Amino acid sequence: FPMKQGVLTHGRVRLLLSKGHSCYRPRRTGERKRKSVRGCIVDANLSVLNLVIVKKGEKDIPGLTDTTVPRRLGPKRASRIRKLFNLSKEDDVRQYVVRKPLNKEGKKPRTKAPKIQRLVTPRVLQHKRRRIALKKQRTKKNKEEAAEYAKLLAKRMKEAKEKRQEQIAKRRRLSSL
Amino acid sequence: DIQTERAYQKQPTIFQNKKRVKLPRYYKNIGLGFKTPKEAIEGTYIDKKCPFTGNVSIRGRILSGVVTKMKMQRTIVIRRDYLHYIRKYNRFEKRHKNMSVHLSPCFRDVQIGDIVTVGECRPLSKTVRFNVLKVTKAAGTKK
Amino acid sequence: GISRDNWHKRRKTGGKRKPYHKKRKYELGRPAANTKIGPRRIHTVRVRGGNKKYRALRLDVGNFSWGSECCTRKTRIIDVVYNASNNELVRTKTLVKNCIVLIDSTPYRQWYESHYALPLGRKKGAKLTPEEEEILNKKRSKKIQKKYDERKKNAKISSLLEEQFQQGKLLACIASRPGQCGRADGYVLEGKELEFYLRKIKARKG
Amino acid sequence: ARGPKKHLKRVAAPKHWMLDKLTGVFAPRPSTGPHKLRECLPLIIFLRNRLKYALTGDEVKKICMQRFIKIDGKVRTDITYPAGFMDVISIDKTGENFRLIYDTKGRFAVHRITPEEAKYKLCKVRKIFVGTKGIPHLVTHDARTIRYPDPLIKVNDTIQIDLETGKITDFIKFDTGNLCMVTGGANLGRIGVITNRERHPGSFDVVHVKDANGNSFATRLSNIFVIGKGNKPWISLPRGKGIRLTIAEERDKRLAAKQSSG
RNA sequence: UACCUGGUUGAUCCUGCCAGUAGCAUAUGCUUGUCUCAAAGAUUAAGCCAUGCAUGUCUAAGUACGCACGGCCGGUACAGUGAAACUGCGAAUGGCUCAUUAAAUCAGUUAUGGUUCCUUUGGUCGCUCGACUUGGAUAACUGUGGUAAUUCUAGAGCUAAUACAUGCCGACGGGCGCUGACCCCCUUCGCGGGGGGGAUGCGUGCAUUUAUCAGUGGUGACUCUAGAUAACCUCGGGCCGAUCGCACGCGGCGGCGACGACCCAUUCGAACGUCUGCCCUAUCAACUUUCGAUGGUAGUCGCCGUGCCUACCAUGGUGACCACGGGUGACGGGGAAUCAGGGUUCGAUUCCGGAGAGGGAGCCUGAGAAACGGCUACCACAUCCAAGGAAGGCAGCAGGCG
RNA sequence: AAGCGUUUACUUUGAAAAAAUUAGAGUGUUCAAAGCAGGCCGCCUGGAUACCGCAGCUAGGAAUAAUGGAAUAGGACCGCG
RNA sequence: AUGUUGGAACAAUGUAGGUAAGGGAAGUCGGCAAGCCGGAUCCGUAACUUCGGGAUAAGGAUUGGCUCUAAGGGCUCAGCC
Question: Residue D138: which domain range?
Fold first, then answer.
């Protein structure tokens, strides 16, 4: 049974765990389940302890301080390339991609490269230029149709008040008979 | 006369404390050809459940019945009589349904036996879903 | 949990209903907010339809209104004196809709001393040491003085409303519902509305 | 239940679709849209069951996504689209245009309209809505929220909108003597002039409609849809022209048609 | 097709019942050559279940550095497939059963002006006065492992978003008002009256809340929608594109789209009400209540109307027209059998609506569940165990026992 | 042309009135139970119609069966002051 | 002034008071003796009956202190006792 960060005991307890909690893998959305977890204070009732060396000592262990395990993946986002090589915000960072060589029997020697994410390209710039056309389309259309309606509202206004004078003239003509 | 509770009852729509140098009483029409009573306009009763000085809208069915009980305050109990046809025996049977109807105090002189006309609206209480629209006088009773 | 269902209780005639289903989710009821006086601590809760309700628990200020002068300002609430629903909501100072509370007068007093610039409150004997309102009382333009002099036609105030301006504590009624929208807005008692609770508060004291 | 329905039984399908009950237990459940479930006709029914281009449901699936079906100015690729009253379903491949018009019975009639007729359709407005900045709005039968309309259009008038631009051209005032289309009930599919309006406050107003052959009848205003002024319609009319001549003479016409040709 | 027959007597005519007669299922016995439809664990056990299956899902268009395949025109990044995984949606539909339930469900009729809303459709979304695209985690993977064991996961390096927070150049150059510096003109001996302009700043998009005031457009009727003034902008802050794919024609603009949201109508539901309708029972005639019973006031909570609940009041409300209560071998209806005419009986059963997943109760997520082919506990039953612990709900299709 | 003109029960009419089932139109599933097709040298067509009582809405009638008018006149009309 | 005296010791048997782990009448002719309950407030209360009773039947809950609120009155609507 895995032990839980910050439980303030040394025995074993059962806790309700939701998404975001340690030692739990949800399957449904908002799923909650009881999980038996061990205490955080270490005593002689343990089997395996995960230990992380922060500061290397002057002695050199052959198992860990000698075996070099490099990075697994190269940086992928466009802005994370700039901070790795201390580049500026104006130069091109596409040629500074961290690619790897590929060599094995049965296949030709190829080279694979990651896709640079959040990088400025003419397709995005065209798409940015596409949505400002809609803003120009919207603002022109509201001004065109409201002025047409305001002209239309003036169009009805001359006929509505002209026919108002027909009733008022009738109101005097009927009273004259 | 009024304001005998813990709180201050008043018409919520109007404002009665504007700068000065009677009350601008709120009243609304109801529709369906029903004439609003004189006492609602000129009276000093205030009630949120009144169909003329309150926030209730009359919709749905319009019924009528005879009033049988008035010991309850601000609401009354009416009686409706009808006959149910049985298809086996070609006869009828007297069945009555006595629902609770809110009585706005705009109608002042209402007597037991008057043929009341009610109107459907939102449920005012657990059983009250009907409000008085007009009070027709009982047969005869000139004294 | 606590639920809002009509079928759990008796009939009109007095007979007992027998349930045919368990508790439904749309009949849900929640514990009361019971907000008090303090720094702003409002908890948002999801409600039916994927909406939000603001469960206030501690509130200090509110956008009360003074309707005769057509002005409203945000002022801090200090005390609760009267509640019509229950007397235990006065001892335990709880804010719900239609509560008679006490507020400071300086947000409204300065508006009288700026837009009209006349002495309100200000028990005679002491003059303003910051001198800002004294500057605002005088030094008007000659063409705007006539417009300023027409502002004194309606510069009269009722004695009861002026009396609570003396101590700086105004009686005001809560109009907004606090546990749902989270705010504590309302209005100041005036005239017939104001004199009614003054009889009731005196009856509360005795 | 615990939510909205998603299936549809074949028995529970409306009678005007005329789907046979021996084929399948289920019915094509119409997707939501500008028309209600019952009086609409899904695009799968109009193709497979009305026009008989398609045989199975997978065959309907492929044709609709070839982008060959253009309903009232916009291509929809859903097989169960709620094609309501007079949706101008335009087919580009054969140059043919369909407008969904009711027959003399309650069924939708397969009416071919001319291409110049396919550019306009008649929509019944529902309410005059004031927008957030004093903006008049009209809501049609297919929920077309048209802002800045003509101010003289009232609650139950009809507007001759234009499909390629989405704007109105003319409108017909609701008045006695104008042509009408009875959209609902026992008189479903009737065409006649309006002769009498009866007012019922609180209840539903009923309007008497005089048929072209003098067969006057009544219908409530909720199932009433004007189509033109006087005796002049604004669209093309199918055979029968919405008369509902009584069943004594459909016996005569069906018998006379067989013996005349031989 | 609206129909009878035998039987009490020594024999007669009646009443009277019994038994024959014909339908309709349910079981069962004997027997059976062909073909077309079609019911089938409802009745006692809504009793218990070995095992197998029944809800998963990718387009050119959200993430592609898994060679797991594979093209060579590459250094201008990913040719293009592609397991997995993050993300999005569905999983609240359908299926089974009829246990509970007697104005209750449900059926006909209306209302939501008393409400919430996934998806779809049609509209809005440079309006606000201050960026050629921000940030850091993490899954897959490498590798260390534990437990007898779970669809158990623990630790260490990493690496992306249509996952998570953040936010602007522009439109934006100025308009409207309020402070209003200060100025001009006329007239008055003179203060005074009127006509005006005005630097500066502030506020000014929609959205939430409070207060106040006049009627663009409607409803049978608004405290409707719109309009104006005064403030408010929920930090457990409301938005106002910090997305992707195909052609590409001319300092930057254009066509075809998908996705994404704020808001309004639309579709779609859900939910409460309104009038009428329900089996038997009096060896059930009075019932309901200060432990809400029926109304009033003020609030809480709720999506909203409401004793739904609370606090203060009135003593009210139903009933012999059967209230209340009990039984029901009662899910209700559309309908089925059977009848000249009327009626009787049935309706577990394919369509509609309600209830449930062994019995209660409570809850997470989600628009929608009090979901159980979702969890959390108790009760009853049952499973593996290394004895430490873990794990289940066939009234879903089969199937097994009773 | 629009509105108001004692109220009902009752009678007539119209709308609103899920399908399936019921009666019933057409149709040689070779017949029939069934099903909604099909027939002619592309066309012709169908997939009707009936009731939905009982309850509720609307419209003609005034016989029958109910309730009521003014007799301490606060009675009905016409001008009124 | 402790009942017609005092002082010092604190042994058994006594007389008069008490307390006892576990069991709870197995003791004894016999629950003898001892022990349980106990006042007040709010619920609730059977068989039987001569309808008056049984009945405080039986069986349950509460009780302290402190700080407040409300109600129940006299003298001229408010004040004062």
Answer: 121-171
